[PDB]
Amino acid sequence: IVGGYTCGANTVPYQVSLNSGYHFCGGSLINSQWVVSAAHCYKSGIQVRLGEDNINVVEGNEQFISASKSIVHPSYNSNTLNNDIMLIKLKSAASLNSRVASISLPTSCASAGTQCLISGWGNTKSSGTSYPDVLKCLKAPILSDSSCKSAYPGQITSNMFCAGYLEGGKDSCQGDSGGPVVCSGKLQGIVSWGSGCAQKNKPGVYTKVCNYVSWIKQTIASN
Numbered sequence: 001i002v003g004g005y006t007c008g009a010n011t012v013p014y015q016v017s018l019n020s021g022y023h024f025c026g027g028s029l030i031n032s033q034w035v036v037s038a039a040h041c042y043k044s045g046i047q048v049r050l051g052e053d054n055i056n057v058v059e060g061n062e063q064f065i066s067a068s069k070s071i072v073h074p075s076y077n078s079n080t081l082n083n084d085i086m087l088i089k090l091k092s093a094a095s096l097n098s099r100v101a102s103i104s105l106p107t108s109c110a111s112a113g114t115q116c117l118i119s120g121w122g123n124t125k126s127s128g129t130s131y132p133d134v135l136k137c138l139k140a141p142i143l144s145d146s147s148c149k150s151a152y153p154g155q156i157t158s159n160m161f162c163a164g165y166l167e168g169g170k171d172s173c174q175g176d177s178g179g180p181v182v183c184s185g186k187l188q189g190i191v192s193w194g195s196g197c198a199q200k201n202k203p204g205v206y207t208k209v210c211n212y213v214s215w216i217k218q219t220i221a222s223n
């Protein structure tokens, strides 16, 4: 997250770190046994780390659980990143509490202008890598479709939306992929891609979760 601030330990109880010997992507806890993340963060040997804050020190409240299965959306296209969503079922349920809680799925899509909270342990620099130890937060609005399409002509599908700042300096970045974009207490987006990080006129692009609600529910139901 570039241009963000320290969230404060466990202030974002639904955030998870996907670890394969190191933190590589974020994710959102949606029920005690399932997490939603991005399809391009898929790999085997994933351990889900809940209740985290400083990812390099155990401080307490952390729960490490291996993933049972990862279900990448069947229509996920790696070249366009269309349908960049994945469900990971945990080997055992997490114990929910105030530091580990699920987030709600939406009932409507959100409008441009809605303000959301984006978090992650991704790069904090737009030029070079600087990965933090604690969770970073950023408040960003959803942009209109015309501003999104002007920024990325021919690269935005109806399963994506843009959020951020056209002037640059504040944005999500690599390492943040798979994590949450929460607006009015609902999971509306998944950190997916962007051109560089926090570059002028190149906002973050997010998976439009409201379009996968029925799929999430059905897929969780049948598994």
Ligand SMILES: COc1ccccc1-c1cc([C@@H](CC(=O)[O-])C(=O)[O-])cc(-c2nc3cc(C(N)=[NH2+])ccc3[nH]2)c1[O-]
Pocket (backbone or CB within 6 Å): 024, 025, 040, 041, 171, 172, 173, 174, 175, 176, 177, 191, 192, 193, 194, 195, 196, 197, 198, 203, 204, 205
């Ligand atoms: C397939 O790529 C990945 C697989 C697993 C984990 C991260 C990535 C991933 C990789 C890479 C690097 C790879 C490198 O240089 O090492 C690449 O290909 O540009 C970038 C991202 C990434 N960039 C991002 C930029 C933004 C943004 N708001 N501007 C948001 C999410 C991003 N995720 C990103 O999500």
Ligand SMILES: [Ca+2]
Pocket (backbone or CB within 6 Å): 052, 053, 054, 055, 056, 057, 058, 059, 060, 062
């Ligand atoms: Ca820790």
